[PDB]
Amino acid sequence: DTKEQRILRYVQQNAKPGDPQSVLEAIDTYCTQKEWAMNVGDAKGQIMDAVIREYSPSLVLELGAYCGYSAVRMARLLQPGARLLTMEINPDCAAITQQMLNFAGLQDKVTILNGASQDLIPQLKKKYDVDTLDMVFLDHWKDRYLPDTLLLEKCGLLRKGTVLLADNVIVPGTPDFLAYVRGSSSFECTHYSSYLEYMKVVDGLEKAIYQGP
Ligand SMILES: Nc1ncnc2c1ncn2[C@@H]1O[C@H](CSCC[C@H](N)C(=O)O)[C@@H](O)[C@H]1O
Ligand SMILES: O=c1[nH]cnc2c(O)cc(-c3ccc(F)cc3)cc12
Ligand SMILES: [Cl-]
Ligand SMILES: [Mg+2]
């Protein structure tokens, strides 16, 4: 079996069904004591929780699901009837994420879309009945962050106040995306310095709030 399958099985055997916080703790314990994995983790996750609670977004888009850690982390703090869509290119990972959300009791709040972000984004309005997004979590692949931000804008999915939250802007790093948002009048940017998941290595989140054309 794969690392991701082992993480899910660990959850299943060391967390409580229906209890999101127990799911996060189990994933964090496994990835600290057994095998590292690229979940946003607890240090950055606490900054993410702070953001979610500030904005209480009704519709969140996540780019990059992996095993579902971040989807559990966000979806557990959404208000009733609020929703998360998450896009995942790797079908094995999509199936793990679904099972993770199911285990957590969050499946009614989350839709996992199996496909590439750049193919799915153009289908959100007509196929997923989306108007505009309240928040975007970018956490898929460093080289897609800029192109997919620009695509989201093109497709009319951002509105004044939409919150872009970007993982890994330091490690692996996303220099094109950062230089672009920081230098654009269309974005109000703040940097949240932290650590790479499970590691004593500096990393951070970028918050970029869309301000209109
Ligand atoms: N273009 C793309 N579209 C969708 N998913 C992508 C993608 N490029 C990479 N990915 C997916 O992005 C994920 C990065 S890891 C995501 C971690 C997750 N947000 C968490 O914190 O728990 C991987 O599962 C990878 O398959
Ligand atoms: O590719 C990644 N996508 C999404 N999130 C990531 C993430 O949080 C960490 C890393 C990562 C960081 C250091 C390293 F040595 C190897 C991989 C990659 C991704
Ligand atoms: Cl951590
Ligand atoms: Mg990440």
Swiss-Prot record:
Give the enzyme's EC designation: 2.1.1.6
Q: How is the cofactor bound?
A: Binds 1 Mg(2+) ion per subunit.
Single Gene Ontology BP annotation: response to food
Quickly give the catalysed reaction. Answer: a catechol + S-adenosyl-L-methionine = a guaiacol + S-adenosyl-L-homocysteine + H(+); 2-hydroxyestrone + S-adenosyl-L-methionine = 2-hydroxy-3-methoxy-estrone + S-adenosyl-L-homocysteine + H(+); 4-hydroxyestrone + S-adenosyl-L-methionine = 4-methoxyestrone + S-adenosyl-L-homocysteine + H(+); 2-hydroxyestrone + S-adenosyl-L-methionine = 2-methoxyestrone + S-adenosyl-L-homocysteine + H(+)
Q: Which GO terms describe its cellular component?
A: axon; cell body; cytosol; dendrite; dendritic spine; glutamatergic synapse; membrane; postsynapse
Residues reported to bind S-adenosyl-L-methionine: 40, 62, 70, 88-89, 115-118, 139
Q: Which UniProt keywords apply?
A: Catecholamine metabolism, Cell membrane, Cytoplasm, Lipid metabolism, Magnesium, Membrane, Metal-binding, Methyltransferase, Neurotransmitter degradation, Phosphoprotein, S-adenosyl-L-methionine, Signal-anchor, Transferase, Transmembrane, Transmembrane helix
**Record note on modification:** The N-terminus is blocked.
> What cofactors are annotated for this protein?
Mg(2+)
The record's GO molecular-function terms, alphabetically, read: catechol O-methyltransferase activity; magnesium ion binding
Q: Which positions does UniProt annotate for substrate binding?
A: 142, 168, 197
Q: Which residues bind Mg(2+)?
A: 139, 167-168
State which ranges are Extracellular (membrane side): 1-213
> Could you tell me which cysteines form disulfide bridges?
none
Instruction: Tell me the protein family, please.
Output: Belongs to the class I-like SAM-binding methyltransferase superfamily. Cation-dependent O-methyltransferase family.
What function is annotated for this protein? Catalyzes the O-methylation, and thereby the inactivation, of catecholamine neurotransmitters and catechol hormones. Also shortens the biological half-lives of certain neuroactive drugs, like L-DOPA, alpha-methyl DOPA and isoproterenol.
Please state what the protein is called: Catechol O-methyltransferase
Which source organism does the UniProt entry give? Rattus norvegicus (Rat)
